[PDB]
Structure 1
Amino acid sequence: DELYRQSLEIISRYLREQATGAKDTKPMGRSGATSRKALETLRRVGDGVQRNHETAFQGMLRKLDIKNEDDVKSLSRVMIHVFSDGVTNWGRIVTLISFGAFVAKHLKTINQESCIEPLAESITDVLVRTKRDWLVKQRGWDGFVEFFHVE
């Protein structure tokens, strides 16, 4: 399943980088190209939504109260509610991922770093399993990179 493999890599890595502060140096699937460009995009845009909505996000993180791994299953319910009006766009998508990064930073500060991969598997699983055809029609992560590109 290529799209799942590629989506997990990107999401998983962004969450780890964000939690730690240290950028991976391991080799992706794409040496020079799509997974790399997607990660670069996600850093620019997703770092932006975190700065610009720090207040809203802290508020949510405090009340969802993500102590442990049971509570990580409750982010899925959040994602499903988000999409439940029928609308799917990249804005919604990047914002979920950026909220995922915000909670990954938080888990690291409570020494629940081992819940970061499950969190990322879980964002990916919702996104791909429920919007697969939409993602493919948008040209996948190539479309993501194109939609947010600024030059």
Structure 2
Amino acid sequence: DLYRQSLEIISRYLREQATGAKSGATSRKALETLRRVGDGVQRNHETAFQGMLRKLDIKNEDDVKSLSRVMIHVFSDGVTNWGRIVTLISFGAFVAKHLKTINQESCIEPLAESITDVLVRTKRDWLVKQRGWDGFVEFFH
């Protein structure tokens, strides 16, 4: 399933980003790709992400769910490309790091489920057309 596969990759990435500690072939290769591209993306948007995180004040699970409802509407507006999808997942990694920092580690998995919901609920057909995670891997390399 698209949702299950997406969640496996996204949860693994957010958790390893937060703790600093690390279809299996596709999932493995997508995670590796995401480690490489997500790194440049997080650094490129660092100040912006910090600013957004500040205003949002995400400190518990309810806040995570609250933010996801708004993200769904924003992400569904405008163009769709892999770079924007990586940007969404990178913001998720950024938030995940913040949650670990403030000792709210229990919120990381719900955040991963919310980021995956944002992605799959709004871009399911685009993802299927682009060949899912295999498409992702092929696109970057």
> TM-score under structure 2 normalisation?
0.91
Equivalent residue of 1:33, what SS? helix
The residue number in structure 1 matching 2:84 is 92
Task: Identify which of 110, 115, 118 aligns with 2:110.
Answer: 118
Separation (CA, whole Å) in 2 of partners of 1:4 and 1:77: 18
Moved over 3 A (4+): none
Separation (CA, whole Å) in 2 of partners of 1:62 and 1:86: 25
| Structure 1: 5+ residue stretches without partners | 23-29
Shift of 1:127: 1.4
Shift of 1:54: 1.3
Cα deviations across residues 48-73 of structure 1 (Å, max 9, x unaligned)?
11112211111111111111112102
> TM-score under structure 1 normalisation?
0.86
More divergent stretch after superposition (110-119 vs 31-40): 31-40
Shift of 1:33: 1.9
Task: Identify which of 107, 118, 122 aligns with 1:130.
Answer: 122
Separation (CA, whole Å) in 1 of partners of 2:43 and 2:75: 23
Shift of 1:35: 0.5
Shift of 1:133: 1.5
Q: Residues 133, 84 of structure 1: CA spacing in aligned structure 2 closer, same or farther, 3 A cutoff? A: closer
State the number of aligned residues: 141
Q: Residues 144, 112 of structure 1: CA spacing in aligned structure 2 closer, same or farther, 3 A cutoff? A: same
Tell me which protein shows more helix as a share of its residues: 2
Separation (CA, whole Å) in 1 of partners of 2:94 and 2:49: 8
Task: Identify which of 67, 70, 93 aligns with 1:78.
Answer: 70
Shift of 1:78: 4.1
Cα deviations across residues 14-72 of structure 1 (Å, max 9, x unaligned)?
000000000xxxxxxx9862101100111111111111221111111111111111210
Shift of 1:91: 1.4
Q: Contact between 2:75 and 2:122, CA under 8 Å: does it hold in 1?
A: no
Query: Equivalent pairs: percent with the same residue?
Result: 99
Q: Contact between 2:75 and 2:118, CA under 8 Å: does it hold in 1?
A: no
Separation (CA, whole Å) in 2 of partners of 1:89 and 1:82: 15
Shift of 1:76: 1.6
| Structure 2: 5+ residue stretches without partners | none
More divergent stretch after superposition (79-88 vs 58-67): 79-88
Separation (CA, whole Å) in 1 of partners of 2:30 and 2:82: 12
